[PDB]
Design an enzyme around this catalytic site. Structure first.
Site, PDB file in Angstrom:
ATOM      1  N   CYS A   1       3.542   1.135   9.503  1.00  0.00           N
ATOM      2  CA  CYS A   1       3.341   0.042   8.622  1.00  0.00           C
ATOM      3  C   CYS A   1       4.874  -0.203   7.908  1.00  0.00           C
ATOM      4  O   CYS A   1       5.646   0.484   7.742  1.00  0.00           O
ATOM      5  CB  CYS A   1       2.676   0.416   7.499  1.00  0.00           C
ATOM      6  SG  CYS A   1       0.792   0.590   7.704  1.00  0.00           S
TER       7      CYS A   1
ATOM      8  N   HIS B   1       0.907  -1.286   0.070  1.00  0.00           N
ATOM      9  CA  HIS B   1      -0.097  -0.112   0.035  1.00  0.00           C
ATOM     10  C   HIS B   1       0.848   1.238  -0.044  1.00  0.00           C
ATOM     11  O   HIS B   1       0.386   2.277  -0.215  1.00  0.00           O
ATOM     12  CB  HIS B   1      -1.233   0.020   1.179  1.00  0.00           C
ATOM     13  CG  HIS B   1      -0.431   0.235   2.626  1.00  0.00           C
ATOM     14  ND1 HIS B   1      -0.383  -0.808   3.565  1.00  0.00           N
ATOM     15  CD2 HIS B   1      -0.158   1.267   3.084  1.00  0.00           C
ATOM     16  CE1 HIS B   1      -0.070  -0.248   4.567  1.00  0.00           C
ATOM     17  NE2 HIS B   1       0.150   1.165   4.519  1.00  0.00           N
TER      18      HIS B   1
ATOM     19  N   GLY C   1       2.867   5.833   9.954  1.00  0.00           N
ATOM     20  CA  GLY C   1       4.298   5.700   9.635  1.00  0.00           C
ATOM     21  C   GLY C   1       4.785   4.352  10.372  1.00  0.00           C
ATOM     22  O   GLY C   1       5.783   3.915   9.933  1.00  0.00           O
TER      23      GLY C   1
HETATM   24  C1  LIG Z   1       0.566   2.189   7.801  1.00  0.00           C
HETATM   25  O1  LIG Z   1       1.560   2.881   8.279  1.00  0.00           O
HETATM   26  C2  LIG Z   1      -0.822   2.534   8.336  1.00  0.00           C
HETATM   27  C3  LIG Z   1      -0.827   2.380   9.990  1.00  0.00           C
HETATM   28  C4  LIG Z   1      -2.140   2.373  10.791  1.00  0.00           C
HETATM   29  C5  LIG Z   1      -2.994   3.768  10.589  1.00  0.00           C
HETATM   30  C6  LIG Z   1      -2.862   4.401  12.076  1.00  0.00           C
HETATM   31  N1  LIG Z   1      -2.406   3.103  12.735  1.00  0.00           N
HETATM   32  C7  LIG Z   1      -2.090   2.110  11.987  1.00  0.00           C
HETATM   33  O2  LIG Z   1      -1.770   1.052  12.449  1.00  0.00           O
HETATM   34  N2  LIG Z   1      -1.806   1.755   7.506  1.00  0.00           N
HETATM   35  C8  LIG Z   1      -2.945   2.260   7.302  1.00  0.00           C
HETATM   36  O3  LIG Z   1      -3.265   3.605   7.547  1.00  0.00           O
HETATM   37  C9  LIG Z   1      -4.197   1.462   6.521  1.00  0.00           C
HETATM   38  C10 LIG Z   1      -3.709   1.816   4.960  1.00  0.00           C
HETATM   39  C11 LIG Z   1      -4.689   0.878   3.985  1.00  0.00           C
HETATM   40  C12 LIG Z   1      -4.221   1.054   2.545  1.00  0.00           C
HETATM   41  C13 LIG Z   1      -4.448  -0.584   4.525  1.00  0.00           C
HETATM   42  N3  LIG Z   1      -5.731   2.223   6.881  1.00  0.00           N
HETATM   43  C14 LIG Z   1      -5.990   1.843   7.973  1.00  0.00           C
HETATM   44  O4  LIG Z   1      -5.287   1.457   8.947  1.00  0.00           O
HETATM   45  O5  LIG Z   1      -7.407   2.013   8.205  1.00  0.00           O
HETATM   46  C15 LIG Z   1      -8.425   1.317   7.218  1.00  0.00           C
HETATM   47  C16 LIG Z   1      -9.885   0.857   7.568  1.00  0.00           C
HETATM   48  C17 LIG Z   1     -10.726   1.806   7.021  1.00  0.00           C
HETATM   49  C18 LIG Z   1     -12.104   1.385   7.406  1.00  0.00           C
HETATM   50  C19 LIG Z   1     -12.693   0.148   8.096  1.00  0.00           C
HETATM   51  C20 LIG Z   1     -11.576  -0.917   8.317  1.00  0.00           C
HETATM   52  C21 LIG Z   1     -10.150  -0.403   7.942  1.00  0.00           C
END
Ligand SMILES: *[C@H](O)[C@H](C[C@@H]1CCNC1=O)NC(=O)[C@H](CC(C)C)NC(=O)OCc1ccccc1
Ligand SMILES: *[C@H](O)[C@H](C[C@@H]1CCNC1=O)NC(=O)[C@H](CC(C)C)NC(=O)OCc1ccccc1
Ligand SMILES: [Cl-]
Ligand SMILES: [Cl-]
Ligand SMILES: [Cl-]
Ligand SMILES: [Cl-]
Ligand SMILES: [Cl-]
Ligand SMILES: [Cl-]
Ligand SMILES: [Mg+2]
Ligand SMILES: [Mg+2]
Lengths: 302, 302
Positions: free
Chosen positions: B145, B41, B143
């Site tokens: 991930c 991602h 940050g």
């Molecule tokens: C990577 O750095 C990031 C870390 C997340 C955000 C804050 N705490 C974490 O562990 N990953 C994401 O931001 C991820 C991105 C997608 C492309 C997988 N999005 C996310 O974590 O929320 C998605 C979601 C939305 C609605 C329902 C279920 C999941």
């Protein structure tokens, strides 16, 4: 989001751990620049453990009585001296892996990472707080002495604990890197007992702010209290009085959540008086006092 | 003695963490031999987050779209490919700090150490268990991930988790180093929800043996039970049934304490039925299911 007991990365400290042998006795040492620190009970003779004469025992020993092992490599001991309860072993080779480091003495309530070690090799890392009764609740077996506690800022390692002994209640005692014990203990097998302990009020409040920041908020009330009112309840439940400086260092956490320190005190008050209704806060069924204000800012702001 | 949630020393993993940028998007990567792994991602365009075409998006990108940073040093990207939900970035320079490593897929109930990282630099280390609902309760912000989960045996690192996302309930999801998700989740912002979770019965029993080994024994009874009898109680309190293989891996802990697995089950039964009488076991006011049989043998035998 999320909130877990979190240690510092141990790499910078792992590259300083060595093994120290004098006779039948082996334990860990800390190789910084041209010097290796370890507990001075590494020179104790088997039966001279009750009240060892450390000055007498140390003058008996050559540089050659001390084997200093750093993998499959023996560092060369060119001097033996003592500062309080720590030996210092001068070596001809400086530690190429030496990092930017201070030695610091921490206060009750303050946390550090422990790198538990056996025969010089790092085994595990965990977070501890210095209790008000100057012990730690760690995990330590035979061979663990010389294991250190540390904090990291930028690239600088602040070493604040070296492990020495286990008290009857299963709790642990040691000194700073100057060899001075935290608390009233001595490095002899004489009968010693951890004093009565208390709950680190400022750290419980910090952790309740950690809860609010991570959306765990069922326990928040809108009741008023005062520093004097709160302290009357604190004293009754074996909590340390909250001081104005304690109020002040919760300023960051108060700013970020919009909840005045004394509003959170009224919430902690009701929790003490009514309990937790069989519920958890950040997955704990009791109030956690092993996270400092700093620990919460650091982990809720990456 | 003593028993604390304990991570592995993170040094060997710290020397593999690098930063990965594609456009405005930055996160961590894992530099092993001539390859850097990171979540795929990292190539998502801002608005194409709802349902990103990863095959389409990846063929659009040169080696030059991916900045790979390892301190104040830029590793040279000479190839971009995808395996399931992980990118692999070939670099011209192999990692001189590369350790002996496997990739492994772990089972629900099994633990690993997380090295939380931001912009390539390690921040903290903590212990997690894969929950039955295939999430972890970690601590992770923007940050984070590309942060990995790992186990260490001898000098070999077993990497078993890479961080991807946060679910609404504050819990975390990711994949193995082959890029396959634990659980039914996808690396898109579509609505997903952690299933219902259960208590890891074998791990609670392990931790009760940890208690007995460390002299915390108030809860031990002398009542009989059977696997079928215990499982009827387990099911009622949202515990996983105990299987014969679960019984078998508690064999070490049963041998060392003299307490038959099924005697400990009768003790766990009474705790489930009557509660804990406002007392703690190893300083917890609830039953801990995040320590494996192995975790207990490892920490109660250094
Ligand atoms: C990577 O750095 C990031 C870390 C997340 C955000 C804050 N705490 C974490 O562990 N990953 C994401 O931001 C991820 C991105 C997608 C492309 C997988 N999005 C996310 O974590 O929320 C998605 C979601 C939305 C609605 C329902 C279920 C999941
Ligand atoms: C150092 O490796 C060793 C580690 C202890 C023992 C098992 N777990 C630990 O943390 N230190 C000692 O063994 C220590 C040696 C003295 C010379 C300080 N002895 C000890 O821990 O018990 C002493 C004691 C006896 C009676 C009352 C109070 C304390
Ligand atoms: Cl210094
Ligand atoms: Cl290890
Ligand atoms: Cl920890
Ligand atoms: Cl492999
Ligand atoms: Cl750090
Ligand atoms: Cl941990
Ligand atoms: Mg001297
Ligand atoms: Mg491909």
């Amino acid at each position: 989001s999320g909130f877990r007991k979190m240690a510092f990365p141990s790499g910078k400290v792992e590259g300083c751990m060595v093994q120290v042998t004098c006779g039948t006795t082996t334990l860990n040492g800390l190789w910084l620049d041209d010097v290796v620190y370890c507990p001075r009970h590494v020179i104790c003779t088997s039966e001279d453990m009750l009240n060892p004469n450390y000055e007498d025992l140390l003058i008996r020993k050559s540089n050659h009585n001390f084997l200093v092992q750093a993998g499959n490599v023996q560092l060369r001991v060119i001097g033996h001296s003592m500062q309080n309860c720590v030996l210092k072993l001068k070596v001809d080779t400086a530690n190429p892996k030496t990092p930017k480091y201070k030695f610091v003495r921490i206060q009750p309530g303050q946390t550090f990472s422990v790198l538990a070690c056996y025969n010089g090799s790092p085994s595990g890392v965990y977070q501890c707080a210095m209790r008000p009764n100057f012990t730690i609740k760690g995990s330590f077996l035979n061979g663990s002495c010389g294991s250190v506690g540390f904090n990291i800022d930028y690239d600088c390692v602040s070493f604040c604990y070296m492990h020495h002994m286990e008290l009857p209640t299963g709790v642990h005692a040691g000194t700073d890197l100057e060899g001075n014990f935290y608390g009233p203990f001595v490095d002899r097998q004489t009968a010693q007992a951890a004093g009565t302990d208390t709950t680190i009020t400022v750290n419980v409040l910090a952790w309740l702010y950690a809860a609010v920041i991570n959306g765990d908020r069922w326990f928040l009330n809108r009741f008023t209290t005062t520093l004097n009112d709160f302290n009357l309840v604190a004293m009754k439940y074996n909590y340390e009085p909250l001081t104005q400086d304690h109020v002040d260092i919760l300023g960051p956490l108060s700013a970020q959540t919009g909840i005045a320190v004394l509003d959170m005190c009224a919430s902690l008050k009701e929790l003490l008086q009514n309990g937790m209704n069989g519920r958890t806060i950040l997955g704990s069924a009791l109030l956690e006092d092993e996270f400092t204000p700093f620990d919460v800012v650091r982990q809720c702001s990456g």
